[PDB]
């Protein structure tokens, strides 16, 4: 087996047209050996993930804090031991409302 | 879109021989939530599919062909298949952790 810390794992800050205020850990990457991509994501206050979506189905975990979550037509907040399952070409994104940090797992199952 | 809170599962308590003082939470591929009394106990064992595991809480002992290694919440794990491992809890307190398994 593998083990491994995931704050151990360097995160990359990512500031884009569509997202701000956010940093990116991949766990368990694309070329990994594992059958499920696995990142950690960590939100600053006031950081946005924008509404987009990908023809491959998300699940997310919510590690700390509030995160809202942005659909097609609405949005609504959840908190830490949430989990969410966004179907292939949903539209979805993020958004920390709070003034503390928050984190995520994104989980992607390979095909 | 899905969103739910995980703790609002019913737990399912596991007492076999090689299971004690354990609980799971059900979340293609599975995602399941254990929880892990003190002195719980989950042992060695293996199975066909992979596994991935983040620990959520605690000081998480875990059980391998060669040994044993704790980690603590933070820590991510990939077991291949047929990997024989298993986990304890040595300390006094809950400790608990997220299981990935894809079905490819």
């Not at 709070?98 to 989980?107: A, G, I, R």
């Amino acid at each position: 087996m593998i083990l491994k810390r995931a704050y151990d794992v360097t995160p990359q800050k990512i500031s884009t047209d569509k997202i701000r205020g956010v940093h990116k850990r991949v766990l368990i990457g694309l070329k990994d050996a594992p059958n499920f991509v696995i990142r950690l994501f960590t939100v600053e206050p006031g950081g946005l993930i924008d509404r987009h979506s990908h023809p491959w189905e998300h699940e997310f975990f919510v590690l700390k804090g509030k995160l809202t979550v942005l659909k097609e037509q609405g949005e609504e907040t959840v908190e830490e031991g949430f989990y969410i399952f966004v179907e292939p070409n949903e539209i979805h994104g993020f958004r920390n409302d709070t003034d503390s940090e928050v984190e995520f797992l994104q989980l992607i199952p390979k095909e």
